[PDB]
Amino acid sequence: VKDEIVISSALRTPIGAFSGTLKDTPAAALGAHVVKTLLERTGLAPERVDEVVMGNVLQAGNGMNVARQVAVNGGLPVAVPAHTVNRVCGSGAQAVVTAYAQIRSGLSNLVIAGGVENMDQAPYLMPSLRHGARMGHTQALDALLRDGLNDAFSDQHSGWHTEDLVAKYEVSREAQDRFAATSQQRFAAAQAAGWFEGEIVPVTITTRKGETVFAKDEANRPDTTEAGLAKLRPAFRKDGTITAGNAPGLNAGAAAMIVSSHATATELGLQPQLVIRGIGVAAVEPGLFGFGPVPAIKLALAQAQWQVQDVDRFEVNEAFAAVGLVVRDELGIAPERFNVDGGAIAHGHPIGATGAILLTKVAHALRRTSERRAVVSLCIGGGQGIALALERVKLA
Amino acid sequence: VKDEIVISSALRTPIGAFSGTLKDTPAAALGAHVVKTLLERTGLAPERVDEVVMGNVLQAGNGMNVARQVAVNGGLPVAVPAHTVNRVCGSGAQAVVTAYAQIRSGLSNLVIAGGVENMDQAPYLMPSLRHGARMGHTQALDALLRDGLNDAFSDQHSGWHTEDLVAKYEVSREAQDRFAATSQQRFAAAQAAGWFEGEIVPVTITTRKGETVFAKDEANRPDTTEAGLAKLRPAFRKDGTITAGNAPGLNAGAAAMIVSSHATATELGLQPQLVIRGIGVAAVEPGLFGFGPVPAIKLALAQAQWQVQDVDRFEVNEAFAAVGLVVRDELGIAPERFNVDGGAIAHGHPIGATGAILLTKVAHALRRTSERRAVVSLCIGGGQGIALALERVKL
Amino acid sequence: VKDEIVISSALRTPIGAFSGTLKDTPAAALGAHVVKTLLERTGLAPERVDEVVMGNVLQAGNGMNVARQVAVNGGLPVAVPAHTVNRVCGSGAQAVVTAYAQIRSGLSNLVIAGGVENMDQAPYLMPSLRHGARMGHTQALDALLRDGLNDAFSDQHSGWHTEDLVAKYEVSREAQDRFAATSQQRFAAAQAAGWFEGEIVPVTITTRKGETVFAKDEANRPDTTEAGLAKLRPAFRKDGTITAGNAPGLNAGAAAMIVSSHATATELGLQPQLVIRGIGVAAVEPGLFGFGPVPAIKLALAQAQWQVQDVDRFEVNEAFAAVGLVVRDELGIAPERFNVDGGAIAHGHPIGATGAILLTKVAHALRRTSERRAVVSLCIGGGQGIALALERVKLA
Amino acid sequence: VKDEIVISSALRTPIGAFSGTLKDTPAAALGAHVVKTLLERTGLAPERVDEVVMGNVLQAGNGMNVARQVAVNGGLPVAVPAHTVNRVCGSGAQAVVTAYAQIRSGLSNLVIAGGVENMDQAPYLMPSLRHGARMGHTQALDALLRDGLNDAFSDQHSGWHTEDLVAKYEVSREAQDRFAATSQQRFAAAQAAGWFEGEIVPVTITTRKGETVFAKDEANRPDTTEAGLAKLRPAFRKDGTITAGNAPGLNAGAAAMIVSSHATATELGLQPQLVIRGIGVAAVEPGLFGFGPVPAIKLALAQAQWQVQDVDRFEVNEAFAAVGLVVRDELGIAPERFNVDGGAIAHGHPIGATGAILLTKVAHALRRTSERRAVVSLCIGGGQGIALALERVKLA
Ligand SMILES: */C=C\C#CC#C/C=C/C[C@@H](O)[C@H](O)CCCCC(=O)O
Ligand SMILES: */C=C\C#CC#C/C=C/C[C@@H](O)[C@H](O)CCCCC(=O)O
Ligand SMILES: */C=C\C#CC#C/C=C/C[C@@H](O)[C@H](O)CCCCC(=O)O
Ligand SMILES: */C=C\C#CC#C/C=C/C[C@@H](O)[C@H](O)CCCCC(=O)O
């Protein structure tokens, strides 16, 4: 058990809205700020960090190796190596899985793992500029669609594919809007109660006329109602059910945490928040966007030797309200135990950071509630799912 | 021995030149072709593949998750998960290290790992197109520079930084050109002897006029001489030493291999080529581009409990001739044991595939020569190094 | 006197600000709207229009032959030919000079002449996209700079060259700012008195949420003060004097008028506004941006057999406050007779339309004041000037 | 005879192929070279040049006022004014008409008129780059299509519209290919006989390894046969008749000449080549691309008091073989008098220069053959036509 792998000091920036407060702040700078703050608050000797692993999906234009920028600009010694992982919308949780594997295999003793993303900062791409278009009009591609949200096999948006999940599982528009309004209401009430203050580190943004201290999530809509959501038009198919109100936005943020054995965390005076009891990574047909969390959660629960009913809360990414409903109802999870404090429809989905954001949220929620067992899971894009089974570590 | 981690069936495409035969073939398609060929030749049951891990540096414009495209278009079942790693010029070796860690930690039993890159296919980037340039001229950035070759902290080319390595270690232009000419001569003789045929899988490219069967490396320059290299102008600093002739090109290629325990490989009827005996990952100041292999090799050798003199061959990426000379000389390696069959100055440096290409090269060279111990190492970009200590597995 | 060449029915749109009300309305559409309104108000038989000539500088992206689009989309019969002229910032006056030449040479009897511009609608240019950039970063050029405001020989902005005019004529910063503040004051007072209502035709702009009727100039800055202008930084040279406050903006608009002999105008029931008594086109060194009006005015006055002191008002384009001061003081024009109702620093400089706008302003101002003699003149860019000497025609 | 308007010293570059020898040489540099050579060969006193007028269609990216660049870099004194005209594919002939109107109206006494174009050098346009694309892919437009070859009302290529002319006049594919093969054969034989050497001025192109002297037209295909043309696929409509072999290419070149009264040319020691006896400019429905030369020719002939049978040769631009056939057969012109030495299918169509190239060709051909009367005409784009009726002037 001393060899159990634990997460300590999980922290996140607030999440920016599209064209919002973080629109001019690169993803790697958001990560560097979290890492700098984590080092400050823990007092961890920076030389005890063996590697930095960061998730980031839209690497275009972010410069050589985002994770190395996070590490060096986060103030770690230049001797700390770093690399960037991409499992699309699961990347921030993949970074933690990568850290687990490096610790259990003996390659590292302590890793800073997390993820970063800023969708406004994703550039446009000009595939014909290197060797020429020659004659005739040519296209400039939005990288957030080409590398992040469109399926690589069909070139259709993930939301377009999710309409086929909607049809297969008969998920009504009204159920999606009810779930979305509930996510907004749960999130706003938790935010108002101060429940996210412990996990959020403020970022100071410098502008022309001055400075903004960005300290609280800004992308949520607390006035959302089922009635207002029913006014909206479908976003991905003319006859569809998915709208801008029952899907997350295009967001920016970062989160990071310390991954180590429990023995190492105790030795260094850290306070572990969660032990990783199981990991699942699964894949399905790419067109079946949204279902991957079901087999991945089953794998993670098998490794943990837990059943669904043993779990106090599930935190499953709300890539679309439809995905949350399908996963919840396929696994038979109680609605009061699913995305308890709201999810990405409210707070935003900064794709390569969201898995780390969900781990951070669970670390702090279990501390507050004294719940013992949680599962974090995300659909990937391209037909994959990732899940972690997590248990609270008591305060020593 | 059961749980030693081994590499089996390492294979690679030939390496394309800049603006060359592979210029219209995406990196993910190159990887898919190697993986399809690997599955066909080994007869490995596709359901035994637990994950595909691919290195790729210039992910811009390649579509969602290059590794998943490699896996699915390589013909693996959609149930095989996949993810893409980026440790810059070490990414293809990082994929193998990631596979090692997944197997030793129990997350996987068998992984297909490798790397892919196509520098011609890297797009240009327009940072001001989303929200507008408003007024005044604006820049379109070459992604291969912004995301691959320029340092992220200084925005200078890696070759500009390597001039400071050259100055610190007093690496003469004459020695850089001697090393580059030797790499071309060694590679040309090995290619003519057929020494790369076993590791290469041909790729058929469909063009306007018909089909080209691309079957052998095309980027080397057998016309290279030291006298010719001495005439070239410096590429990165006015009074510099690094030129287009003592640096590799901007290349395309892919390589992949099976990583598993030795017991799993024997059970499934594979023929292991190499056992991973040590892994080193190190970092230094970003400005000291090129030195990273020295500490990384020392880490890998310490894990293997080998000394430099025990190693039959070192395969260290020739990111510039100057880097090869510094690493060789600082570790005291004999020149006949350093990049024995030539290196990237001759064959090319498709950045995210090169580490997997070098592992492939060593797997086949140790089989041919019966040498026992090798080290593969690459500098990263950004001040890092990766190294693996590798031992031949008998037939 | 029957064969004298006259201007009738001069009209203009209001002038839009940069990123303002006309930002989505192409220059050719602005011209079409003026031409359609001119035809409706005059009742001119459309078959009597022999040609349409329009000035336009930033032709990039406007589609084949802007003048033909203005004519056809303005409702003229397809049998009316049309062509587009470019003498940079003098293009809208050049269109009238071209019309004069076609009528006096017998090629035409009646021409609709004017100019159009919309600086927001100027695209960016990618010179390397056709045949490729190959390797290394490449530039996307702002067409308004490449084709409109930068000198073609030096690639420096016209405002950079004007700093040498400032140094040659010892034009103080304080005098430039006084001239700019006075232009704003004169314009704001004339606008409030209703003096621009007769020349302006409103344009209705359709948007997502509805419609805007754009009916009055929007680019002026009536709360400009000399003290506020003194705080601004130089725009073109570190140690310069020209700023954003003593130069016009980047504007959009159109203007058009009928040009014919006097006999033809009377025959067709038009009411001539001005007779063209002299035309001057001159050129000087490109680096001497701003001086061209001086020799051009002298040529136009020589043709008209007038002296400077015979002229009731000069309307000289305020490309920069410094140009207005140099031209006024070199010719010895009384300040109360120079840009009497304000100029482009206040109302805007939609480059290819401005010459037609100034002719329109003078036609209406002389009608209102009963002044007899005026001169319109503009510097061009590239070291040229254009001028017309104009006399009021009494009502029939 | 005194005040008749004459053309002297007409000269042209050779015409470059698309992606050919002139691909790196701006249009304005081609014109400056012709003007410099014209001044050197005639010995004309540069102070006697009153204006430079140049046609140019694809002005995007060519810098401020192409005609002023031609004049200044051609070595004329900076005191010579200049402006650029755009009547699409008739621009180079429009520059001569503009010069005629300025001389007859008394604005000028001697003008250098011509046209320039380089289609390789036309840039791509990015309409969304100024104010952003926000989200989603966006288009980069080829300026040669947007501003030169596509109709401004339909956005279809001029060749697509010409398929309707083909259908209206029942112009068979076999006839189009016969006309195109004959144009190639006539051009190749005339070129081999040396008949274009007198009008061409060589251009020296500086390249990597050294210098190329470009001295002869390169875009023609002397091996063209009717049987080879029959194999080609239609270029503009799937069921079409127009192919890359019965249409011109995308070419580069320049041409210029001196325009003055006959008395002025004699006074200055020039040798007039042609007198302008009639000018016609006509317009028709835009969709009837290609028919415009018919009414324009009729107007020019009426001005000259000539009929078709009085004309020794017609030089009508081969915008497509179909256009040449329709114009020839509607006017009843003898086939051996229509495009006698070949036309643009063979030599190329550098759009803004072609009208000036055709005038140059006729000036030299009439001198060689002692023919007396010729007509030059071009379709415009957008449903217009321009024509000039021209008579040889004897040597003094
Ligand atoms: C791994 C994968 C995934 C995914 C996803 C998703 C979310 C899509 C929402 C996005 O399309 C949203 O509707 C955009 C609204 C932007 C509106 C604006 O321009 O402000
Ligand atoms: C991880 C890092 C790295 C690195 C490196 C490198 C190689 C650079 C060589 C490249 O600059 C080469 O000189 C380009 C020549 C291209 C010439 C052409 O346009 O054909
Ligand atoms: C023929 C020639 C000319 C000319 C001229 C001019 C005016 C230049 C003013 C322009 O540079 C102005 O300062 C631009 C301000 C725009 C600020 C914004 O982004 O809103
Ligand atoms: C004013 C008007 C007009 C016109 C016109 C025209 C000519 C079009 C020929 C062009 O479309 C040709 O097909 C282009 C071939 C280029 C092929 C290549 O890429 O090399």
Automatic annotation (TrEMBL), chain B:
Write down what this protein is called. Answer: Acetyl-CoA C-acyltransferase
Source organism per entry reads: Massilia sp. YMA4
